[PDB]
């Protein structure tokens with residue numbers, strides 16, 4: 001393989017041969033690619049239209065180089081709640097809030113995350129503001145998961161060899177296939193998740209990668225552009241189970257959710273978004289709570305999907321009940337406090 | 347303007363707004379663009395499919411930064427003979443040989459050129475091997491033109507600010523819109539030319555740029571892939587005159603040219619290609635001479651087109667007569683000798 005061969009094939013609007021995307025990502029991860037080559041590859045793959053096989057190869061190479069968690073420390077039913085980011089809406093941290101609520105319901109959560117790229121405060125920024133240790137290594141993330149019920153894998157901590165690609169993503173500024181990689185490369189490799197995708201045209205491809213792994217995931221794109229299940233309108237869901245993908249449209253009105261305005265979900269700096277987390281966990285009612293409960297329920301539905309017996313509507317109803325109860329009993333608020341104490345007691 | 351705005355527009359498969367391509371190229375030439383940004387732009391523009399407006403903006407910025415020739419030193423009817431390169435067929439230096447013959451016929455030639463990128467010997471390499479100086483600045487190129495009848499503008503010498511783009515081109519290896527820029531950025535700005543394009547899908551766009559400038563040009567693509575008028579099969583010509591482009595198919599068999607095999611035009615290192623030049627100018631008959639005469643006649647037809655009264659078939663017949671006579675009288679051989687002599691006596 002060579003860069004001229006691979007890049008030439010992409011600019012010819014052709015799918016890559018098996019193994020070529022992998023070779024490219026390996027060159028990138030081993031420090032052997034010039035920034036110009038990295039950028040040309042990211043752009044060319046995006047404009048060709050990436051296939052699930054290709055994106056799967058990219059994510060597979062990243063995972064092969066990532067720091068793993070210790071043997072037998074991640075439950076077979078652990079879930080992730082994470083999105084691509086890049087929706088350009090600057091909301092409160094819906095995935096992070098949902099993750100806390102899901103863990104409080106008793107579903108093990110190992111969340112992959114990072115600081116903000118374009119928004120005012122990303123999941124990692126907000127957790128930091130709440131006093132959570134975001135940059136623990138493999139052994140301590142495993143310990144967090146076992147003792148608290150949730151662990152957070154900071155992407156830069158677990159994927160240090162991606163640093164050159166991460167720099168190129170920032171330099172070019174335009175979204176590319178690389179923006180899909182975060183949700184696809186959780187180093188703990190959980191088999192379930194609620195996975196947000198800001199890019200309507202790339203969501204089916206992400207779903208295809210998860211299908212190949214036989215994960216149970218809901219890949220979600222709010223029809224208002226959110227990389228979350230939205231409350232302002234419908235969301236498109238690519239449901240992944242039994243190695244298959246099927247496309248659905250989801251309307252929260254079917255479960256009694258009132259319509260919100262996008263401005264009602266607006267986020268601020270890390271202190272503001274941390275205050276938003278505390279308000280929800282403290283039982284404040286309103287649009288933010290509704291969106292958190294909806295997303296937590298989605299992640300519980302994906303968890304349920306790890307069983308072949310699970311049915312869609314009963315799963316949502318149970319998920320909504322469990323999410324609401326986790327907040328209402330104080331379990332979610334207490335879990336966050338316990339998570340903060342865990343990090344200080346190490 | 348910003349890179350995210352411009353690159354985002356290209357990845358959305360949209361034509362740029364007026365001025366955006368120019369802004370991008372100016373950033374590139376002022377040293378303000380990261381290699382990753384240069385690469386992303388070159389690739390995205392290529393895959394979107396560049397327009398003549400866009401490519402003309404890129405070339406316009408290059409020419410605005412280039413070292414120009416001194417005032418009133420380039421004849422209004424000066425012609426260029428130059429191609430994109432990148433046809434991967436590794437031939438003898440047909441444009442360079444044609445240029446010498448054209449000048450010997452009495453048409454002023456200012457040729458733009460560079461060393462090889464993928465072939466074994468490019469035009470500048472072969473001229474160097476022949477003892478011609480390829481390192482002359484604007485004043486001396488003007489003098490060469492006045493005294494010998496031909497001048498050679500070495501691209502790196504006249505476009506030093508392009509060094510960052512040139513580096514990126516080498517790093518990624520794949521052809522892009524940047525590969526069109528050489529024939530479009532002759533710093534002497536001649537109004538006529540025979541212009542080779544290896545990329546069949548970009549030849550019409552090059553023609554459009556010349557049409558905007560009201561040049562008289564033949565943009566040529568051999569149907570065997572040569573960035574020259576070929577002798578092995580037909581050629582496609584985009585004829586540019588009066589600000590208009592029309593596409594023609596050209597068969598040299600119509601003027602009594604035997605069909606050649608591509609093997610018969612193959613080149614070697616600089617020393618070998620120099621020997622091919624000496625052989626042709628010395629009167630050696632065979633397929634290389636045929637291809638040189640054909641391309642020289644093409645350039646003479648483009649020069650003829652600077653008059654609105656010119657007519658296609660008579661022009662070709664006269665161009666072929668003049669090209670053949672320039673060789674047969676010894677004028678071409680003697681012109682090369684005088685060109686070598688000029689540079690040794692500076």
Ligand SMILES: O=P(O)(O)OC[C@H]1O[C@H](OP(=O)(O)OP(=O)(O)O)[C@H](O)[C@@H]1O
Pocket residue numbers: 081082083084085086087088090092093094095096097112113114115116117118119120121122123124196
């Ligand atoms: O700055 P942006 O590109 O818009 O990214 C917004 C955030 O969403 C993603 O994470 P995640 O979904 O884990 O965080 P969330 O809690 O904010 O949803 C991403 O890692 C950022 O943290």
Ligand SMILES: O=P(O)(O)OC[C@H]1O[C@H](OP(=O)(O)OP(=O)(O)O)[C@H](O)[C@@H]1O
Pocket residue numbers: 427428429430431432433434436438439440441442443458459460461462463464465466467468469470528542
């Ligand atoms: O290495 P490659 O990319 O194949 O390019 C072959 C040559 O063709 C172009 O020049 P030009 O047409 O001026 O010279 P020539 O046709 O006489 O070689 C290019 O600048 C190279 O010199």
Ligand SMILES: Cc1ccc(Nc2ccccc2C(=O)O)c(C(=O)O)c1
Pocket residue numbers: 114155156159160161162163164165166167169181182185
């Ligand atoms: C999937 C993933 C993983 C890590 C990422 N970032 C980094 C990787 C290595 C070193 C530093 C960083 C960083 O973003 O600061 C990124 C990124 O920021 O694009 C994405």
Ligand SMILES: Cc1ccc(Nc2ccccc2C(=O)O)c(C(=O)O)c1
Pocket residue numbers: 460501502503505506507508509510511512515527528531
């Ligand atoms: C149109 C044009 C002009 C100059 C070029 N190369 C250079 C430009 C500045 C400095 C050095 C070079 C070089 O190729 O050595 C190039 C190029 O090599 O791609 C193209």
Ligand SMILES: [Mg+2]
Pocket residue numbers: 082083085094095096196227228
């Ligand atoms: Mg999210």
Ligand SMILES: [Mg+2]
Pocket residue numbers: 083085087091094095196226227228
């Ligand atoms: Mg989000």
Ligand SMILES: [Mg+2]
Pocket residue numbers: 428429430431440441442542573574
């Ligand atoms: Mg040529």
Ligand SMILES: [Mg+2]
Pocket residue numbers: 429431433437440441542572573574
């Ligand atoms: Mg050529």
